[PDB]
Design a protein around this ligand. Structure first.
Ligand SMILES: Nc1ncnc2c1ncn2[C@@H]1O[C@H](COP(=O)(O)OP(=O)(O)O)[C@@H](O)[C@H]1O
Ligand SMILES: *CC(=O)NCCNC(=O)CCNC(=O)[C@H](O)C(C)(C)COP(*)(=O)O
Lengths: 490, 78
């Protein structure tokens, strides 16, 4: 009786498990056991796990469009769960075990999911009684609180159905199966990944980069090598994990490299199997990049540029070598099927080489909108200023860029105060608003201070540890320091 | 723990007041020790002591508190 996506309909299940039919006994996952032994899970075994979890989820009587919060690390079980949800047209919302309780309750209060699922050994408690709770693992899917009874109204799952919603106020980027599959078919055309690659992925599951990596590995028929935080956060463990698993590609925000470059460059140079690196989210400092390139001469390095609302836009391979005089890396050219307009403040195309305009993107991987926020959606997904009468829309990105002499793009900052911390969007005004509401604080300023830059709060007023907790806002948005000051200097 | 250790740890916990005792059981994450910070603290300790943390000693439990980290350092020297 549960609706299931048909094989011809754009859907993460069919797209990411195609290799289960065409190459069943190739690896989909490489993990290392408690004894430092490397294990592989095939496409065949992963599909089997997805189908078992789907049979169990379908018993809960959820309707297509019903939301499922998945709290987990990037694990085979977690990816089976999100693909099981995909098959049944249950949009999933990824959250990490390390997500603050305050932040998880804000997502539950905003999304109103029918179900929260965590791993057998997850420690999340006190999920409100209006949300179903289940645990998944070796034992299958076990219900604690079944979701409330309902009538199923949706007969058939379609490509425009929501695959996932990525989350001061939690902003839900609503992404269709059609959009996500379109992004991957564009990338597949570039031959950037082969089924022979083993892609090390570093971002926790709640970040859009984790979903990108998952879909990139599985949709290509490649092996995903999730790097747990217990390896990632310790350069010598990180590097031994990449060696043991035989990672051929390593994906992560530039920050993942900074501790390794500073403290274990010799061991880094030993990663003879790494054939490529991909970074996105923020600028990679050029000295650090030149250092990395010098240590791993046999690695292609790709600069990916994109926002959550299209997932991706453009890339370049970094020039080999990086010229000494080079002031700024190119973000290269849009993927095939994507198109960028650079518009001035009047919506007019910027035609002159080297003059910045606001990126307006035409993409087959566009988000459907912001969860329950049609006003935010109308501000960002706008009438095509070059074709307003067709009804067609573009992503107004807030990013500035200019073109070079070959038409390649160059990121030129933003139209607003937005900064990146480890590739995470941050509106300093938001951290400021929050500290201004801490009892004692009359004025506040948050800025990136320069190793990687740190978020510093300067406040006019006091327990800096207590003001920290009151912030602890998402994780990456919590000041590395809160310094009381007599006046904010202009 | 010796005066060198307190001074190094204090460097990586900006929410600890100059005037405030470094409590042996203080959750260093709650005093501002983050992912990058933790690796900088490791490197500072290895550098100042000539100590080597074996792979098994590089974990969040050993770096959670000054008392846990002092014992781990002490075990590495031994
Ligand atoms: N390669 C890049 N170089 C510089 N800035 C980038 C790059 N990729 C993304 N950004 C910045 O990050 C923003 C998007 O952040 P977010 O929505 O978290 O997604 P992601 O960081 O994965 O692209 C962009 O609007 C831009 O400001
Ligand atoms: C949409 C999207 O995914 N954009 C990129 C967002 N950023 C990332 O994927 C960065 C992933 N974050 C991290 O790796 C963490 O910020 C650390 C670096 C795991 C946090 O370390 P410690 O700081 O707890």
């Amino acid at each position: 009786r549960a609706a299931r996506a048909r094989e011809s309909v754009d859907n993460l299940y069919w797209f990411m498990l195609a290799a289960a039919n065409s190459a069943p006994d190739t690896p989909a996952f490489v993990t290392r056991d408690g004894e430092g032994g490397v294990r592989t899970l095939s496409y065949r075994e992963l599909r089997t796990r997805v189908d078992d979890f789907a049979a169990a989820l379908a018993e809960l009587g959820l309707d297509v469009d019903d939301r499922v919060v998945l709290e987990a690390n990037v694990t085979p079980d977690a990816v089976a769960m999100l693909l099981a949800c995909s098959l049944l047209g249950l949009p999933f919302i990824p959250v990490s075990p390390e997500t603050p309780s305050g932040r998880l309750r804000s997502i539950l209060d905003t999304a109103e999911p029918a179900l929260f699922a965590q791993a057998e050994d997850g420690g999340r408690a006190d999920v409100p009684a209006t949300v179903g709770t289940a645990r998944f693992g070796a034992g299958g899917l076990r219900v604690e609180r079944a979701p409330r009874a309902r009538v199923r109204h949706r007969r058939e799952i379609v490509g425009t159905d929501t695959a996932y919603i990525i989350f001061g106020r939690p902003k839900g980027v609503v992404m269709s199966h059609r959009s996500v599959v379109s992004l991957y078919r564009a990338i597949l055309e570039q031959g950037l990944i082969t089924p022979e690659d083993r892609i090390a992925t570093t971002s926790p599951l709640q970040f859009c980069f984790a979903l990108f990596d998952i879909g990139l590995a599985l949709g290509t028929g490649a092996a995903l090598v999730p790097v747990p935080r217990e390896e990632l956060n310790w350069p010598r463990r990180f590097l031994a994990f990449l060696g043991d698993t035989g990672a051929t590609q390593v994906h992560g925000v530039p920050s993942i490299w900074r501790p390794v470059l500073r403290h274990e460059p010799e061991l880094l140079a030993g990663l003879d199997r790494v054939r490529g690196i991909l970074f996105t989210g923020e600028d990679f400092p050029l000295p650090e990049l030149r250092h990395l390139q010098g240590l791993l001469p046999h690695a292609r390095i790709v600069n990916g540029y994109g926002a959550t609302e299209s997932m991706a836009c453009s890339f370049t391979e970094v020039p080999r070598p990086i010229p000494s005089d080079l002031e700024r890396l190119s973000i290269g050219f849009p993927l095939p099927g994507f198109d960028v307009s650079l518009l001035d403040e009047h919506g007019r195309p910027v035609e002159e080489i080297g003059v910045a305009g606001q990126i307006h993107l035409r993409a087959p991987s566009m988000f459907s909108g912001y969860w329950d926020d049609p006003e935010a959606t109308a501000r960002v997904l706008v009438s095509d200023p070059l074709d307003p009468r067709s009804g067609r829309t573009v992503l107004r990105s807030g990013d500035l860029a200019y073109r070079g002499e070959d038409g390649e793009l160059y990121f030129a900052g933003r139209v607003d105060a937005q900064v990146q911390i480890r590739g995470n969007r941050v509106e300093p005004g938001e951290v400021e608003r929050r500290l201004l509401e801490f009892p004692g604080i009359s004025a506040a300023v948050a800025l990136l201070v320069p190793n990687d830059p740190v978020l510093h709060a300067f406040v006019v007023v006091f327990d800096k540890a207590k003001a920290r907790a009151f912030c602890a806002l998402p994780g990456y948005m919590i000041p590395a320091n809160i310094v009381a000051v007599d006046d904010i200097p202009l | 723990w010796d005066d060198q250790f307190e001074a190094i740890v204090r460097r990586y916990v900006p929410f600890l007041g100059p005037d405030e005792r470094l409590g042996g059981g203080s959750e260093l994450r709650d005093l501002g020790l983050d992912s990058m910070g933790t690796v900088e603290l490791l490197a500072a300790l290895e550098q100042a002591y000539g100590a080597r943390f074996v792979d098994d000693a590089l974990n969040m439990e050993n770096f959670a508190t000054p008392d846990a980290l002092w014992a781990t350092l002490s075990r590495m020297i031994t």
